[PDB]
Amino acid sequence: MFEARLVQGSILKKVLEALKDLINEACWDISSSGVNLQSMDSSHVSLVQLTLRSEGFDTYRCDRNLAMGVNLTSMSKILKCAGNEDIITLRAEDNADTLALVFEAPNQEKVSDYEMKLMDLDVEQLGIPEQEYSCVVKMPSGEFARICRDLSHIGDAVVISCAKDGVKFSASGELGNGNIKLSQTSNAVTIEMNEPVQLTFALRYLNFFTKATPLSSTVTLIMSADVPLVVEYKIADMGHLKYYLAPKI
Template sequence: MNANTLEIRTVQATAFKILVEALKELLTDTCIDFDETGMKIVSMDNSHIVLVHLKLDAPKFEYFHCESKITIGVNMLNLYKLIRTINSNDTLTLFIESDDLNHLGIKIENGEKNTKTTYKLNLLDLDNPKISVNPADFNYEIMLQSADFQKICRDMSNIAEVVEIKNVGNQLILSCKGDFCSQETVLADTENNSGSKNNNEIVQGIFNLKYLVLFTKCTNLCSTVELFLKNDYPLLIRYMVASLGEVKLCLAPQSQNHV
């Protein structure tokens, strides 16, 4: 009989650290849901411009025990402070003891060094508004090298505040205009699954580069990133969290006046 209400363990501790490092830039205090299927976050940032949808699957963990659905409130920055020392050979265990529901236990173990560190993070009493995520039929699903996408976003953020992302056929065009110069980057022959009957339909949107740069903190989670595009609709970006699951980041578009 497990004395813990919740106990999950993974050897993919580095991926979990990278994930939390990225999410702490978008979410301050957030609710994390656990049930027998896995771990989930569905939350908006304080400005309501970004929606984070995270799902880590229970079978992908080395051990996953969750007696019943439980929701915890966590400060993401404080969580990151405790796991930032994780190295590639560490194993991470998260647990909540049945007789101590106000703390999240965090255990970091290293078999090679024969070390074990345990933290108890104070949990928060947060409102947990239900956010419904309706599936959308996107015109284009585009796969890019995640490092390439990160470089483009970083470079453009030094020039302008917003970027226009446009897809025509098999070409993805990113363009921005600042006070001292403009930039256009064309990625031809992008891998995409067109949901549109007209493959030459122009799909475009204008998005805040500051948030895109924050999204690309997920770059080291996986080698590729998927962009989902639809006119007059948020941009959806999906990263795989190693082999644990996926995180989808949605960014609301800005008006033409911002270009």
């Protein structure tokens, strides 16, 4: 049987709050090492890669390696029924068509048991050439979210450009045009440029990603010429949440 117990249930709540809007269906890969997930939106414009190492769990067991197809909308709803300090436990049989979620209230007197149904899914194989670390940006996750929200009012897309003055985000609309410039001096925002890069992206998806903001204090942006953008959030020494995004033209 599979059994994964997590003390900080907030993490799982936060995870699905991030995915549900970006992705509806997804397959959960389980192993002796931990929990992983990988799926692309219907438009294949974006890809998600989740990693949750077993060592992060208070109690972990996985006899047989699994691949659980799931409705993330249906699954996020169940996690609404969880509190931010409920110990969450996931449970399933070696041959599972259902997934069991158990929330333990900290009051030590309330225990919820939700059991959801799985779906048969067509998984995708990939496919990735490893990044040229042409331009990399470490900065507060909130600030990134703010930036994406601001320019979302201006236009439908953003132009990101690197230099050693720093990195720059630009949007344009019938209203006007706006440019936010970021410079390094800490320490905190950090810009490591090896080459000047310049690409365009859709703000819609960036605004989806930023709902993963609560997971990390910082966000990382790996950018390379004519290859998809990478947006990474670390998950408290438990793993990482990685967003891939395809540019335009």
